[PDB]
Paper text:
The Escherichia coli enzyme EcAIII catalyzes the hydrolysis of L‐Asn to L‐Asp and ammonia. Using a nature‐inspired mutagenesis approach, we designed and produced five new EcAIII variants (M200I, M200L, M200K, M200T, M200W).
The determined crystal structures revealed new conformational states of the EcAIII molecule carrying the M200W mutation and allowed a high‐resolution observation of an acyl‐enzyme intermediate with the M200L mutant.
Author numbering:
A (entry chain BBB): 179 to 313
B (entry chain AAA): 2 to 159
C (entry chain CCC): 3 to 159
D (entry chain DDD): 179 to 312
The structure:
């Protein structure tokens, strides 16, 4: 699974996700990646999110939309919503993985509960940051 | 606020003990090149939709990452690819699942969003739709890599 | 307070285009299925068993666009989809794009209970269901004159 | 499309949805019915929901989960959440249809913005109600 989120100079948010699934996958199995609100969500009023992980738990917990709803309805910051979903709710259901998120104010978060997540981010005009392991 | 991009190439069990620096630098170089492409597009005033589409197309093209070229193998030694894109301005979205004959699933997902009234297409129906919109059929072998084939053989032995 | 609700679809249902006998057949079908569920809930049956059985009955009933009585695609085929979710475990099962399974809601529950997965599509979903002992049906078992005539009317307009 | 929601005597919620799609559908199109949080959702902490309508707008608005989130995070009543989703948000996105919902307290709602919705409901130990029109 791979993905991208962005906030443009016009204040628009977008998200995209793509995957080949899992080694040795049961043919016809669908994970969170192609499912709106599970592995991919964007709304100018809140956040853009792309997820990666074990799949089934991100569907059951509607992980990408849940970030948006915690912020929009719950009043949580992006940091608070990311902690709640990735570090508390997903593990409670036996889920592992992470996500990338940008809110309408340009805050960026790359939470993961796994040993690693291949990732990078950068503000327009600035030097990018890359990561594989935990900080 | 300021324009910004983030990308990922997957979360999982990645350990220094199991990895080499040569492998690590290949991933860092790939992530850096893709995020810099997106940063430059944002700086030039390109849309968030065009930026995430291009970043994911490049992650698909890159055989290091499990999407498009470099996809994992199913139990049946096939590739089944899935993708989604969403526009936060219109709340439109497009998605494909179970596609085997489209080089860039994220571009097929964007075709569903932009050139149909629909959100999600699967399998043969998704491919026939994409072919009618001018996307080319590819051999499913174009995604296949020795690294992912060896991972399938090891998962079977396990 | 145990309770069931069911639906058989929302849309442009107009008195002007309906007959009283048609309305009575819908009312009889809805009443019979909601009463089945009420009596299951009264007997202490689970919410999951109740929603599964109510949807199985709506599938079997040719008046409703699910299972027997499914609408036709552009290609004169049937493509059926279903989902079930258990609020106690937050487990879910779903199938999309299946043509050779009589009761899609039972195939959805099979994904939930007899696999680690949530969603299966197309021939892979069907092959999984068959491997788990669900029967393969002829794709024409869902076909009805009423729904075929609606496809011909859609082609005229 | 058809569906059912229930709250049992043990306090468990469940939802199910099933469809044949739309007359003259493009083969391979997927609507909200098989998508968790779009056409079907259940959580013992909030609500069980099954949706029916034009499909795409229920996916884009995650209608079934949105009811749950408006209640759980927004503090909306089931009636308030149903009014917001079915009468305001879905029509704003060009959508039409309805849903059935039961909350963890045994409140039941069958909102729809269409001319009709084939529907019924009943409490354990009481008489059922059916409906076709508004
Ligand atoms: Ca049982
Ligand atoms: Ca009474
Ligand atoms: Cl390190
Ligand atoms: Cl080919
Ligand atoms: Cl009469
Ligand atoms: Cl009525
Ligand atoms: Na790739
Ligand atoms: Na039926």
């Amino acid at each position: 699974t791979v993905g991208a989120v962005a906030l443009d100079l016009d204040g628009n948010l977008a998200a995209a996700t793509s995957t080949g699934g899992w080694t040795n996958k049961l043919p016809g199995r669908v994970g969170d990646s192609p499912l709106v609100g599970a592995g991919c969500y964007a709304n100018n009023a809140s956040v853009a999110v792309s997820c990666t992980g074990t799949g089934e738990v991100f569907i059951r917990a509607l992980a990408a939309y849940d970030i948006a709803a915690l912020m929009d309805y719950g009043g949580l910051s992006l940091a608070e919503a990311c902690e709640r979903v990735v570090m508390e709710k997903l593990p409670a259901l036996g889920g592992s993985g992470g996500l990338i998120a940008i809110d309408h104010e340009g805050n960026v978060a790359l939470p993961f509960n796994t040993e690693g997540m291949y990732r990078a981010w950068g503000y327009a005009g600035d030097t990018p940051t890359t990561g594989i392991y935990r900080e | 606020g300021k324009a910004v991009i983030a990308i990922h190439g997957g979360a999982g069990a990645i350990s220094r003990a199991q990895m080499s620096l040569q492998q690590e630098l290949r991933y860092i170089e790939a992530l850096s090149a893709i995020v810099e492409t997106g940063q430059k597009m944002l700086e030039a005033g390109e849309s968030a939709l065009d930026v995430v589409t291009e970043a994911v197309r490049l992650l698909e093209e890159c055989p290091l990452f499990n999407a498009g070229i470099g996809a994992v193998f199913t139990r049946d030694e096939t590739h089944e690819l899935d993708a989604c894109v969403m526009d936060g301005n219109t709340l439109k979205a497009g998605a494909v699942a179970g596609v085997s004959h489209l080089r860039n699933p994220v571009l097929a997902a964007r075709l569903v969003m932009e050139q149909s009234p629909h959100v999600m297409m699967i399998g043969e129906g998704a491919e026939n739709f994409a072919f009618a919109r001018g996307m080319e059929r590819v051999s499913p072998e174009i995604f296949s890599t020795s690294l992912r084939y060896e991972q399938l053989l090891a998962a079977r032995k396990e």
